[PDB]
Amino acid sequence: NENFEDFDVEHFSDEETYEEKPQF
Amino acid sequence: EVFDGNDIENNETKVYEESLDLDLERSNRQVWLVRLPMFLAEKWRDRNNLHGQELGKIRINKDGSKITLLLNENDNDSIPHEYDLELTKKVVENEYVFTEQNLKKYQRDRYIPYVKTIPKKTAIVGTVCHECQVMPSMNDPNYHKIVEQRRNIVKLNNKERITTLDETVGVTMSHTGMSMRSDNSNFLKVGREKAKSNIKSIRMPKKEILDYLFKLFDEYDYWSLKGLKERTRQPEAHLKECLDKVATLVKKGPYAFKYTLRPEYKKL
Amino acid sequence: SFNQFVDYTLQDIICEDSTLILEQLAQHTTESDNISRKYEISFGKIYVTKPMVNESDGVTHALYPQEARLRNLTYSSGLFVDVKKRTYEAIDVPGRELKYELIAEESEGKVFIGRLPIMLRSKNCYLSEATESDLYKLKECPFDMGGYFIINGSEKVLIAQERSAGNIVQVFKKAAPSPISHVAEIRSALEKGSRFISTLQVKLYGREGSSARTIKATLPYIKQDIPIVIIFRALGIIPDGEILEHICYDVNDWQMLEMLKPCVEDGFVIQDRETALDFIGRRGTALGIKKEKRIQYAKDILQKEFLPHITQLEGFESRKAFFLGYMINRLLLCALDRKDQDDRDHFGKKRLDLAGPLLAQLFKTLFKKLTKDIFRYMQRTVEEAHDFNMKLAINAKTITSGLKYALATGNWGERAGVSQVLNRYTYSSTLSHLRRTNTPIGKLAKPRQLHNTHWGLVCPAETPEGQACGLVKNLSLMSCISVGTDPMPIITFLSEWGMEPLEDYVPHQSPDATRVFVNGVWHGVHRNPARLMETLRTLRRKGDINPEVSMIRDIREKELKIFTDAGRVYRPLFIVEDDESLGHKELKVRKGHIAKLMATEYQDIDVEEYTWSSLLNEGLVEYIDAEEEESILIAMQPEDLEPAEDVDPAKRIRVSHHATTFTHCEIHPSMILGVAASIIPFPDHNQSPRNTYQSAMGKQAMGVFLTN
Amino acid sequence: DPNEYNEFPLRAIPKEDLENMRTHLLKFQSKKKINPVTDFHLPVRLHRKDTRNLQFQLTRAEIVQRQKEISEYKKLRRKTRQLKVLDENAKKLRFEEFYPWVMEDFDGYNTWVGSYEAGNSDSYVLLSVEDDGSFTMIPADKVYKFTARNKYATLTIDEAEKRMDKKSGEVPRWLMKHLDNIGTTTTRYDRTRRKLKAVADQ
Amino acid sequence: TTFRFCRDCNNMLYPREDKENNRLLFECRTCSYVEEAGSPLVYRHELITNIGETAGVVQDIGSDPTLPRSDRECPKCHSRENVFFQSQQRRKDTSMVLFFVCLSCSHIFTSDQKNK
Ligand SMILES: [Zn+2]
Ligand SMILES: [Zn+2]
């Protein structure tokens, strides 16, 4: 595996925000 | 002392000689509620001490209402022999001292005649008039000893560290799991104490076993297999071979799963 | 933290549930078998072996960390307990009380309960007593610091888990649509008990514009919010005047009494202690209590479940009611806006669970499971008449696999990421990972910001740039975490140096009395708090009280808080005293003390060994946490802010603060930084995000992580 | 030292009159002075009873009155179980203090129920002042705080729920006065005086 | 408001309309204790509150090292050394007026000029 401190942004990863805000 | 209250039958006259009422004429006794540090408390509250001996002398100076306690030299030399009695409350109200003692059991408007009252011989033996706290005097030659003791209270630790086994780890683990040694402990040897009991029974003749069964049915009408077996010492097969002939098992009554005598022999 | 855990907490966990009693009733159809048996298995002293490994073929030999790393073994050591087996028999006569006696089958006897993984360079590890040449013989790096576990050959570091402190009253303003305006909650916990968390919430219903603003508290195992007046009467304080005396400590606080009036309006039609207890027992959620036992049910809830951090025993209803009134008082000050809601980001209200508390709660759970398995096997054997074997009674694989699994995978149970693979990229990366801390994150707080109370305790610029920004913190260089001491000697010292008990405390005849809290437990009041604080600080500076103990005097609020629990992050500070010889404030440490320190250092590189413990013992330095940091004034450097007052234009502009009342001095301000930020040259000449970026990227450098 | 003051010897109690006798501390919780010699209707009965269902248990005057009237009238099992271990001192403490102390006068005018107070029951020492001015020392073992009950006709739990219920509106400010004027749920003392006057008028 | 309690049972007293004298009687809801009202005011409600701004003033407030020291003149001692703090009432719309505690006579003198 890998363990890096260099924050490479996870592209195409909006479903975290979708599950964070699923209700309106 | 178990007892039931709300007794309108007046059984307390017969079951207690001592009066249940609160004894009160000692209530005018003057009592000082005195607080102590732990060394004086441990010396003065243990029951192996306190044989009526003198423990000190009280001096009251009326110039400023100062109270000093001077202990005797018989108990210890590390503790001070002069203390000041600080009056935390000069006037103490609604505070009394009562004793509790066992009794002599030998020789709207709706009410219930049952309270579950436990009566005890009680007696108000004093009235608290002065709340006092004991302070060691500053000028005593043992006040520094008291300071050292109170520092040792927070200095010492009451818990010891874990013990580390310095023996060889193989010698330590020789007791574990796979081991040659059999368990010599006898803790919960239920199988050992149960398998040693063996019931071996001979075949007595049919006339004898039927006579014995008829006598036991005359003794008591309903029987279970285990109880009648420990009464008769017979094999299950022969015991059933006689029991079906001269008895029947109950299947639906309140005494079900029990062998009882036949109704023909019941009248005999 | 690990040394404290192994030395004391293992024995504490064993001794809380040391005994286990099973009664076999007679079940007698005939009176010939009227005997009742009582089998007790009692645990005693616990022993820990040196780190060992058993091979396949049963050979057990001493295991060293290099061999464990090479062979993918767990660097663990065996735990043994003394087990003594009491057995009792009684004549089972109905009606007559059973009297048990020994049959003298009191067998006792160390038995194996599992393998505890050993953190390297701890008191159990082989590398603690090894010299540098011994480390070279064992092929261990002398620069290697330990601090980690070896689980299946992988170096595992236990990240410190940040949690909000227990036994503290925190008052919070709720949202506008909610009918409750303010909530005063305490997450009551006890350390020497069942370790269960009970949340007591005292809630003020109705908004500011409303009229019927009542106060109701959420008792444990009660399905409804009971009014506070009903709870006070159930605790035994009947009159309204006495209830308002327990809650409000000023006779002229008619704001507070006016807000408390709807509470006694709500609780007016209960006027008896048994009526209030019947009310609480009807609101009991167990739903298995008969009509006449609800009084005792509510009494048991109020004794064993209501505020357990105070006590579990009976006879302390007055103490619990005083604490409840203090909670309602704090709630009403926040409602009247005399104080704001308590800061969730205050670092003194936080605790850090190191390897001690984490393995402590894990071993507690695993030992409960072990004792449950012991009782289950013993019950099965006595029921089915099988032979009892203690090797089958104890499954050591329960403890062994539980500790091994929770240290191999970070799932702390049966919280994720508690244990991570130790970073071995560079030496500084290993140090930063070993001093790394973690904060779990869904509340209404803002925990990602660098708080004011983070000064000198965590690094101001060392944090990941991603989702872990602000949650993952790194300790400052001199910052330490307390391992926890017993508060009972300090409570006894207070009781014999003037803290009168709370049972005899009357607030109206003691208006100037200072409340005394020990680990969040209100134990009493003191008439003169200043000299008590003076003698307590003298004891801590002379070393009689443990220097990790934090003592705070809030003069404005008339409070004296003493914290002896674990998890508190503190830092050392110089002590500044009066120094009447020179007529001005000055540091207690002098050039003679510095020379003694340097002589000890150069002897290490014949005089007396003058150490950090010596500086702590005659009290030239002091351990200050974020809570004690609130009541002190600190100078940044000695030789400018201590003595009384042409400058170089190249030097930075510095203020002298125009105040000479200092109680402490910073040792050096560069020690507010962490391991990665202390590699940065001139970090005060840099923009702070660039210091954060270098703190991130210094772990990805190439160097020599270890010499082996 | 000059004898310009008064000076009193101090001594401990003998242990012969400490066995089978426990010397507790009584503390009435009241704003006014309480004196059981004067403020109480003799005889006073300090005993250990079940306090649940107050106002429905008879006072001693009604007890002796009913004694007089009836005297005139007549003339598969579970084999194994787990025991949660508990310490013996608190087990005995719970067993003793399961029923609280109750001190009642003859007419029910003063009824005081005592709660055990465990905070400082082990540090108290009583100095009894004897007739000759000496001091005798007693180790106080337990402390009880006595609260007066049924002094203002407390109402019951069921219609207490009915008043708590939001179906009913605001509780009236003088509901107790209305109930006392009607004659509902009166004091034990008032009921005792009613019973004694209904006996005495015959 | 000056809340007052019954002297028989220590419950608070409530207002009573009287008819035979047209007067205010403070009366206990439990045990029928009635007394005269010393003031006609029975309910007092502050919308702007000025109490609690000087809360926490204790006789050893000068023992706090965190409190700043000033040199402003005490108008009871003519002394220079003192401490000061802002308003302890922590509303969001309160003023920033300094309150000074003299360390010789424990006097509370303010920096306000609109009041003076
Ligand atoms: Zn009243
Ligand atoms: Zn002045």
Short mmCIF file of C-alpha atoms in Angstrom, two decimals, chain C residues 270-572:
data_model
loop_
_atom_site.label_atom_id
_atom_site.label_comp_id
_atom_site.label_asym_id
_atom_site.label_seq_id
_atom_site.Cartn_x
_atom_site.Cartn_y
_atom_site.Cartn_z
CA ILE C 270 -45.43 17.21 44.75
CA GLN C 271 -44.53 18.09 48.34
CA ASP C 272 -43.19 14.79 49.70
CA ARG C 273 -39.99 12.82 49.15
CA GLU C 274 -41.89 9.56 48.63
CA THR C 275 -44.30 11.33 46.26
CA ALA C 276 -41.34 12.54 44.18
CA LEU C 277 -39.73 9.08 44.30
CA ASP C 278 -43.01 7.51 43.19
CA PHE C 279 -43.15 10.04 40.33
CA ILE C 280 -39.63 9.12 39.19
CA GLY C 281 -40.34 5.40 39.63
CA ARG C 282 -43.46 5.64 37.48
CA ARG C 283 -41.30 7.35 34.86
CA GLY C 284 -38.81 4.47 35.21
CA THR C 285 -38.19 2.80 31.85
CA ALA C 286 -37.60 -0.77 33.07
CA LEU C 287 -41.38 -1.48 33.19
CA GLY C 288 -40.90 -4.52 35.43
CA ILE C 289 -41.40 -2.94 38.85
CA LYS C 290 -44.51 -3.64 40.92
CA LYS C 291 -46.60 -0.92 42.54
CA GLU C 292 -44.91 -0.87 45.96
CA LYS C 293 -41.27 -1.13 44.78
CA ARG C 294 -41.16 2.03 42.63
CA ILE C 295 -39.94 4.05 45.63
CA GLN C 296 -36.96 1.73 46.04
CA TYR C 297 -36.44 1.69 42.26
CA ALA C 298 -36.18 5.49 42.14
CA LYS C 299 -33.91 5.44 45.19
CA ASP C 300 -31.59 2.97 43.45
CA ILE C 301 -31.59 5.12 40.29
CA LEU C 302 -30.76 8.22 42.36
CA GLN C 303 -28.02 6.37 44.27
CA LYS C 304 -26.30 4.19 41.65
CA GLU C 305 -27.07 6.02 38.39
CA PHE C 306 -27.66 9.71 39.18
CA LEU C 307 -24.26 11.44 39.12
CA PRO C 308 -22.03 8.35 39.55
CA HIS C 309 -18.82 10.42 39.44
CA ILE C 310 -19.66 11.78 42.90
CA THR C 311 -20.38 8.42 44.54
CA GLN C 312 -22.12 5.08 44.15
CA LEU C 313 -22.94 4.65 47.85
CA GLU C 314 -26.06 5.72 49.73
CA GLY C 315 -26.23 8.65 52.11
CA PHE C 316 -24.85 11.29 49.72
CA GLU C 317 -28.15 12.72 48.48
CA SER C 318 -27.13 16.11 49.88
CA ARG C 319 -23.89 16.07 47.86
CA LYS C 320 -25.73 15.04 44.70
CA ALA C 321 -28.37 17.74 45.25
CA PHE C 322 -25.68 20.37 45.79
CA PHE C 323 -24.06 19.31 42.52
CA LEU C 324 -27.44 19.41 40.75
CA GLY C 325 -28.04 22.90 42.13
CA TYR C 326 -24.57 23.93 40.94
CA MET C 327 -25.47 22.61 37.48
CA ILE C 328 -28.73 24.57 37.45
CA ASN C 329 -26.83 27.64 38.71
CA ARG C 330 -24.35 27.43 35.81
CA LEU C 331 -27.26 26.91 33.40
CA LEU C 332 -28.98 30.02 34.76
CA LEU C 333 -25.84 32.18 34.58
CA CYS C 334 -25.55 31.22 30.91
CA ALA C 335 -29.28 31.89 30.43
CA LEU C 336 -28.92 35.33 32.07
CA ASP C 337 -25.80 35.89 29.90
CA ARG C 338 -23.55 36.55 32.88
CA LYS C 339 -21.33 33.88 31.29
CA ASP C 340 -21.37 32.57 27.76
CA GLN C 341 -21.66 28.92 26.76
CA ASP C 342 -18.57 26.85 27.49
CA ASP C 343 -16.01 26.63 24.70
CA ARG C 344 -15.91 23.19 23.08
CA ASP C 345 -12.42 23.89 21.69
CA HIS C 346 -10.78 24.74 25.04
CA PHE C 347 -7.85 22.33 25.31
CA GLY C 348 -8.06 22.14 29.10
CA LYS C 349 -11.51 20.60 28.70
CA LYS C 350 -9.97 17.89 26.50
CA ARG C 351 -8.20 14.65 27.35
CA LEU C 352 -5.73 12.60 25.29
CA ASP C 353 -6.03 8.82 25.56
CA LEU C 354 -2.52 7.41 25.17
CA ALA C 355 -1.54 3.72 25.03
CA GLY C 356 -2.35 3.36 28.73
CA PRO C 357 -6.05 4.31 28.71
CA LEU C 358 -6.70 2.74 25.29
CA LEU C 359 -5.24 -0.65 26.18
CA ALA C 360 -6.80 -0.21 29.63
CA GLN C 361 -10.36 -0.02 28.29
CA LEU C 362 -9.58 -2.70 25.69
CA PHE C 363 -8.21 -5.08 28.34
CA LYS C 364 -11.17 -4.23 30.58
CA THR C 365 -13.61 -5.27 27.83
CA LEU C 366 -11.58 -8.40 27.06
CA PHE C 367 -11.38 -9.35 30.75
CA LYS C 368 -15.15 -8.94 31.13
CA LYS C 369 -15.50 -11.31 28.17
CA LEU C 370 -12.98 -13.69 29.77
CA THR C 371 -14.82 -13.76 33.11
CA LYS C 372 -18.14 -14.25 31.30
CA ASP C 373 -16.61 -17.25 29.51
CA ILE C 374 -15.28 -18.57 32.85
CA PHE C 375 -18.73 -18.34 34.42
CA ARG C 376 -20.38 -19.89 31.35
CA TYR C 377 -17.99 -22.86 31.26
CA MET C 378 -18.24 -23.35 35.03
CA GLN C 379 -22.05 -23.26 34.88
CA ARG C 380 -22.06 -25.76 32.00
CA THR C 381 -19.75 -28.11 33.91
CA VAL C 382 -21.79 -27.99 37.13
CA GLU C 383 -25.04 -28.42 35.16
CA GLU C 384 -23.96 -31.30 32.91
CA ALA C 385 -21.77 -32.97 35.59
CA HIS C 386 -18.59 -32.74 33.53
CA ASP C 387 -15.12 -32.38 35.01
CA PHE C 388 -13.82 -28.85 35.57
CA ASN C 389 -10.54 -27.97 33.86
CA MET C 390 -9.15 -24.49 34.45
CA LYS C 391 -7.25 -24.55 31.14
CA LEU C 392 -10.65 -24.74 29.44
CA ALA C 393 -12.19 -22.31 31.94
CA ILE C 394 -9.73 -19.62 30.82
CA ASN C 395 -9.43 -19.02 27.09
CA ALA C 396 -6.17 -17.07 26.90
CA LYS C 397 -6.73 -16.67 23.16
CA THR C 398 -9.55 -14.24 24.01
CA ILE C 399 -7.18 -11.68 25.56
CA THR C 400 -4.35 -12.50 23.14
CA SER C 401 -6.41 -12.23 19.94
CA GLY C 402 -8.31 -9.18 21.20
CA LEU C 403 -5.16 -7.18 21.95
CA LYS C 404 -3.42 -8.46 18.80
CA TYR C 405 -6.37 -7.67 16.51
CA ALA C 406 -7.00 -4.21 17.97
CA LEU C 407 -3.30 -3.36 17.65
CA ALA C 408 -2.92 -4.82 14.15
CA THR C 409 -6.08 -3.26 12.72
CA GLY C 410 -6.89 0.12 14.24
CA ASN C 411 -10.49 -0.87 15.08
CA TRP C 412 -10.61 -0.42 18.86
CA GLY C 413 -13.34 -2.85 19.84
CA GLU C 414 -14.70 -6.42 19.97
CA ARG C 415 -13.01 3.94 16.63
CA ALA C 416 -10.85 3.15 13.59
CA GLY C 417 -7.28 4.13 12.83
CA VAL C 418 -6.23 4.16 16.48
CA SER C 419 -3.14 2.06 15.69
CA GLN C 420 -1.19 2.90 12.54
CA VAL C 421 1.93 1.44 10.95
CA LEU C 422 4.87 3.42 12.30
CA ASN C 423 6.40 5.82 9.78
CA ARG C 424 10.03 4.86 9.12
CA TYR C 425 10.77 7.30 6.31
CA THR C 426 13.05 9.57 8.35
CA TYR C 427 13.99 9.85 12.01
CA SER C 428 11.98 13.07 12.32
CA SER C 429 9.06 11.36 10.57
CA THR C 430 9.16 8.58 13.17
CA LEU C 431 9.30 11.14 16.00
CA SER C 432 6.39 13.10 14.52
CA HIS C 433 4.29 9.95 14.09
CA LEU C 434 5.04 8.89 17.66
CA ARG C 435 3.97 12.30 19.00
CA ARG C 436 0.98 12.54 16.63
CA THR C 437 -2.52 12.90 18.10
CA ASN C 438 -5.97 12.42 16.58
CA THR C 439 -9.37 14.04 17.15
CA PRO C 440 -12.47 12.15 15.97
CA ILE C 441 -15.01 14.31 14.17
CA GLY C 442 -20.37 15.39 14.11
CA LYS C 443 -20.97 18.31 16.46
CA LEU C 444 -21.69 22.05 16.36
CA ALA C 445 -18.11 22.94 17.35
CA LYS C 446 -15.26 24.20 15.17
CA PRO C 447 -12.45 21.84 16.22
CA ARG C 448 -10.29 22.30 13.11
CA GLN C 449 -9.13 25.80 14.10
CA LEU C 450 -5.93 26.39 16.03
CA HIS C 451 -7.31 27.44 19.40
CA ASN C 452 -5.73 29.87 21.86
CA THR C 453 -5.39 27.08 24.44
CA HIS C 454 -3.23 25.12 21.97
CA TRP C 455 -0.22 27.31 22.87
CA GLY C 456 2.75 25.24 24.00
CA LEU C 457 0.76 21.98 24.03
CA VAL C 458 0.26 21.15 20.36
CA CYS C 459 2.21 22.50 17.41
CA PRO C 460 0.73 25.66 15.85
CA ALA C 461 1.75 24.66 12.30
CA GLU C 462 1.94 20.89 11.85
CA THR C 463 -1.21 19.34 10.37
CA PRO C 464 -2.27 17.52 7.19
CA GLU C 465 -3.67 19.56 4.32
CA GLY C 466 -6.60 17.25 3.60
CA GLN C 467 -9.63 16.08 5.57
CA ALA C 468 -7.45 15.70 8.69
CA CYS C 469 -6.63 19.42 8.87
CA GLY C 470 -6.87 20.46 12.51
CA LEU C 471 -8.18 17.07 13.65
CA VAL C 472 -4.73 15.45 13.54
CA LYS C 473 -2.51 17.45 15.89
CA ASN C 474 1.12 17.03 16.89
CA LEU C 475 2.47 17.62 20.37
CA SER C 476 4.85 20.44 21.18
CA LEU C 477 8.36 19.40 22.19
CA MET C 478 8.09 19.95 25.94
CA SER C 479 4.39 19.04 26.17
CA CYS C 480 3.53 15.92 28.17
CA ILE C 481 0.36 14.02 29.08
CA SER C 482 -0.47 13.16 32.68
CA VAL C 483 -0.77 9.47 33.55
CA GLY C 484 -3.25 10.05 36.38
CA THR C 485 -2.93 9.80 40.16
CA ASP C 486 -5.27 8.94 43.01
CA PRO C 487 -7.34 11.97 44.14
CA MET C 488 -8.07 10.43 47.56
CA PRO C 489 -4.87 11.66 49.35
CA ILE C 490 -5.55 15.19 48.10
CA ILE C 491 -9.20 14.96 49.20
CA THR C 492 -8.07 13.80 52.66
CA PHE C 493 -5.46 16.60 52.80
CA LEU C 494 -8.17 19.14 51.97
CA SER C 495 -10.49 17.68 54.62
CA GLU C 496 -7.82 18.01 57.33
CA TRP C 497 -6.51 21.36 56.06
CA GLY C 498 -9.84 23.06 56.27
CA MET C 499 -12.25 22.00 53.52
CA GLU C 500 -15.46 21.44 55.42
CA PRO C 501 -17.78 18.77 53.98
CA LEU C 502 -20.62 19.67 51.64
CA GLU C 503 -23.14 18.00 53.97
CA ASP C 504 -22.75 20.81 56.53
CA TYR C 505 -22.51 23.63 53.96
CA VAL C 506 -25.11 26.40 54.20
CA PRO C 507 -24.64 28.93 51.37
CA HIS C 508 -26.36 31.92 53.00
CA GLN C 509 -24.19 31.88 56.13
CA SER C 510 -21.08 31.31 53.96
CA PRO C 511 -21.39 33.85 51.13
CA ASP C 512 -17.63 34.20 50.59
CA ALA C 513 -16.82 30.49 50.76
CA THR C 514 -14.91 29.04 47.81
CA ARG C 515 -16.20 25.80 46.33
CA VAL C 516 -13.61 23.01 46.07
CA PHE C 517 -13.79 20.55 43.16
CA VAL C 518 -11.51 17.51 42.88
CA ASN C 519 -11.60 15.87 39.42
CA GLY C 520 -14.90 17.63 38.82
CA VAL C 521 -16.41 16.39 42.11
CA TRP C 522 -17.58 19.12 44.47
CA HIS C 523 -16.28 17.98 47.86
CA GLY C 524 -16.89 21.04 50.03
CA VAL C 525 -16.07 24.69 50.60
CA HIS C 526 -13.17 26.63 52.10
CA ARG C 527 -13.32 29.87 54.07
CA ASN C 528 -9.83 31.11 53.11
CA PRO C 529 -8.79 29.70 49.71
CA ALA C 530 -5.61 31.74 49.16
CA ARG C 531 -3.50 30.14 51.88
CA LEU C 532 -4.86 26.69 50.96
CA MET C 533 -3.73 27.31 47.38
CA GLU C 534 -0.39 28.54 48.74
CA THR C 535 0.28 25.38 50.75
CA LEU C 536 -0.95 23.11 47.93
CA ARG C 537 1.35 24.83 45.43
CA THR C 538 4.19 24.59 47.97
CA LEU C 539 3.59 20.84 48.21
CA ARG C 540 3.52 20.44 44.43
CA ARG C 541 6.68 22.52 44.01
CA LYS C 542 8.47 20.49 46.69
CA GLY C 543 7.24 17.25 45.11
CA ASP C 544 4.92 15.98 47.86
CA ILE C 545 1.92 16.19 45.54
CA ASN C 546 2.52 14.73 42.08
CA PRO C 547 3.52 17.60 39.74
CA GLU C 548 1.07 16.33 37.09
CA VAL C 549 -1.78 17.41 39.40
CA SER C 550 -3.34 20.65 38.16
CA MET C 551 -4.65 23.21 40.65
CA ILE C 552 -6.71 26.19 39.52
CA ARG C 553 -8.05 29.07 41.62
CA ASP C 554 -10.85 31.01 39.92
CA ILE C 555 -11.12 34.00 42.26
CA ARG C 556 -13.99 35.65 40.36
CA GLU C 557 -16.14 32.49 40.40
CA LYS C 558 -14.87 31.48 43.90
CA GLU C 559 -13.78 28.02 42.77
CA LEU C 560 -10.76 25.79 43.39
CA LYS C 561 -10.40 22.95 40.87
CA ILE C 562 -7.94 20.09 41.36
CA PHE C 563 -7.45 17.63 38.50
CA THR C 564 -5.47 14.41 39.04
CA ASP C 565 -6.89 12.40 36.13
CA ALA C 566 -5.03 11.14 33.08
CA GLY C 567 -5.12 12.67 29.62
CA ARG C 568 -4.32 16.26 30.60
CA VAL C 569 -1.75 17.90 28.33
CA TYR C 570 0.65 20.09 30.32
CA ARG C 571 3.89 21.92 29.62
CA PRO C 572 6.72 23.04 31.91
#
